[PDB]
Symmetry: D2
Subunit: 274 residues, 4 copies
């Protein structure tokens, strides 16, 4: 499509794009914002090189995407509670915090101090993962829901490795296996190995073959892109329709990023129509 106010360079044939010709230190006019939002909706993960911005500017940019909440979480930046420090879940493919009834809609991350080489982030499209399934596979699983919890990350199953709050780790939520993105209207797969326990109404054993197949299917290299971080890069990813993977190939070097979270609504099959 046509971009007049920004320059967009797609990273692959599936997802990811470099956005230039904008200064995120400044407020964005309506026309420029609308192009950024349509690039976000199309490309699903977008990155802005060369944006030496402040905390308030990071927060204000984030707010264009949706609400960002006065969080004061343990890793909140002092004086700027909407920004968290990320200093280095992780190295399995996932999307963030799917154990919540309403996970983030997006995340906006800024490199503060990063390696010259190493520390890439993989991304993939769950739209493409869904669309490459056969019509029969689609019809078979489209109505299923999946139980998500943090039990293997900070709940009882985690604790039971022998060598946050445990109740909060164990609390289950249920999301559709196939979700409709509230902004693009597109269907995407919604499952991940970090937080998904089982299909709602099935046993774990019953669920395992299907979940394992979907994990392997979604993560084929051709559904993926790889983002390199440079100092002052801003990355925004769609937390509903992508998954990501943190690459730890920079042993012994400092990696510091700041993060804001944009709030979403309950993942759903639709937002009041089909």
């Amino acid at each position: 499509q046509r971009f007049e106010r920004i320059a967009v360079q797609p990273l692959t044939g599936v997802l990811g794009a470099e956005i230039t010709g904008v200064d995120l230190r400044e407020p964005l006019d309506d026309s420029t914002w609308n192009e950024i939002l349509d690039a976000f909706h199309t490309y699903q993960v977008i990155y802005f090189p060369g944006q030496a911005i402040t905390n308030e500017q990071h927060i204000a940019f984030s707010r264009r995407f949706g609400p960002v909440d006065p969080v004061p979480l343990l890793k909140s930046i002092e004086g700027y509670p909407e920004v968290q420090m990320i200093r280095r879940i992780g190295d399995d493919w996932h999307t963030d915090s799917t154990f919540l009834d309403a996970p983030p809609a997006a995340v906006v991350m800024r490199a503060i101090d990063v390696p010259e080489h190493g520390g890439d982030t993989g991304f993939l499209s769950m739209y493409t993962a869904w669309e490459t399934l056969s019509p029969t596979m689609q019809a078979t699983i489209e109505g299923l829901n999946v139980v998500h919890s943090a039990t293997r990350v900070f709940g009882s199953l985690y604790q039971a490795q022998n060598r946050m709050d445990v109740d909060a780790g164990d609390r289950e939520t249920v999301h559709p296996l196939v979700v409709t993105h509230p902004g693009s209207g597109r269907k995407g797969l919604y499952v991940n190995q970090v937080y998904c326990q089982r299909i709602e109404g099935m046993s774990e054993k019953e669920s395992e073959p299907l979940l394992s197949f979907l994990f392997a299917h979604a993560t084929k290299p051709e559904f993926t892109c790889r983002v390199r971080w440079k100092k002052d890069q801003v990355v925004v990813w769609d937390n509903l329709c992508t998954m990501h993977y943190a690459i730890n190939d920079y042993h012994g070097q400092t990696r510091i990023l700041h993060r804001t979270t944009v709030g979403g609504v309950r993942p759903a099959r639709h937002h009041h129509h089909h």
Copy 2:
């Protein structure tokens, strides 16, 4: 509840010993109906001590459904419905690559080892019934492509009539038994290739899960063969497994096949 025969179940899931009946003789209606009841309930049934003839084996078989005049290479001379079986070891049921596989098989031990050569059986009713309602609802409408390609078609030839080996048929994943009215799972690793409409990759995890689920020991029984034992198994709602632990000994049985109707979800 059985007045004309004596029935001793082999396990809590399937299999039963039937005594108090002489298969040399014609069966009156009341006795036949009890045998058919026992067959429908226990799914694999065995009659010890039945020193019968070929025509008697054939006539007993005909009570279950049609048995076809057509000889095979292994037909007994003079008795083309009876075949000699002389000696499998994956769980299967027979000939599911056909549009209409056998409904049942009636096998008679002629000369068999004193120990060794058991046959495992399992119930696909119980395999189906131990799946959660949600798993059931999710897969009940699927159909499965069966062929003999890995037994005597192109895939077999590539690792070791080929057109007949490759010919595909489709059966429901879940079938209703035409006599009992019960639903059972219908899949096996020997002949099932993929789920109709799905790729192989899509299909394999679900098929492998169902194969592993159906073959848990508690869904199973084990039949020992004795001279003159007659065994009948339901070829739709059971699977079986040939145990080869009798290296170097003669094992001869006779078999008749009872014809069935196309496996289906409803009649």
Copy 3:
């Protein structure tokens, strides 16, 4: 066999022993034949043996000293005799319904178990057995050479340790003692391949209930090999199936067999009494 009658159950393992009265002391010649049959057939059963507790204990003592198993409740009056019991009304976890051999989380697991039917269903409640000699002997020479030197980490974590506590499938108070979680998590290491101290034969020694990983490997590294061995050892042709009749006594070798409890008797009482004979540390050689 001159003193006993032995009827093998299959071509791989299992035999019926008759012509013996276990109410009586056994002369040397008869005992030696029973031991021969045990070593050969690996699981042996004696049909019509309406014996008392002292007699069960005395028969057990011929195999080795009595060393009770941690998890099971003792019968009233006899600490060496333990229950396997399930009630008509019970719906909780069934004791033994994955392939295993007993208590492999111990440094020195039982050598053998002698179990007697007290009150059992007319049909239902069989026990599966398999031979780990045969499991080992059907591996290719190259597979054998590849894994013969490996050891395996065993623990009870999924039965009464932290992983058990973390899940919902729960044992009944009926046959099973209250237990310590640290003792459930405690690791022991055994060889993957063991030499039976009585027969001198090599057998595979791994089971899905108690084995966590191969010593020195990660769980991920271990899983393919362990899963392959579990599937390989449990093929039906390596197996037999024992039916219980009232007063049948069964003896199994706890080192070279595995067993499987079949629960196809929902709604019926099943009671058996059991004595456990102590063994020594599993090892690759006894020289």
Copy 4:
């Protein structure tokens, strides 16, 4: 380290951009030695702005070893040593190399290296994944390493152009691919599971899903779990890099210690690259007896 070339590593595991060199020209000894160093270290190297001709591509290739064309691929027009990787705008058939593999491991002596040049490539799309089998090997536990180091693996082309290929329906186009012999597709060779690179002296894992059939001496059932585990382990994203192609980019990869993966995310566009293959020696555990 580098005085004659500029080297920019792509990731912390493998891959590097090489600039400050003109591949139209012969390379002096000092410059070649640095390129070879970089190749040995980074395992896949790429040279962005190299509008070279066929003779120059061939002459650069010869610095790595002699030219030994790969069985499957079609030669270009005036040059039998230069082969096409090509997919047309229109094409819907099997894509060349869309499983992780290294090339032609069914040969007793597979290629040591490949040098590939972009002729006409999409503006976005058609990346190639690479990974390091040194790093795959080195992240296995010492005990796992000791357990499998002595195994050998049977390779053949049966699923690419032998009987198993003929028995299935997913078909290559006539476009980049020669008509092939089924017996040659089925012919087995055996390589060690762990190989020593003859130039770097480093051990790397040597297994791939395209050509490996079983472990020598084992049944298929015995072999499958180990091979599947190694395939999954070697292809973790952190062992990988992703190379984007620009027109006139020259890429050289080590065919012994890397694997690669062709990404097909450019449905409806032409992609043409030209390739020369450098011959290598029998993979082996040691080059010192």
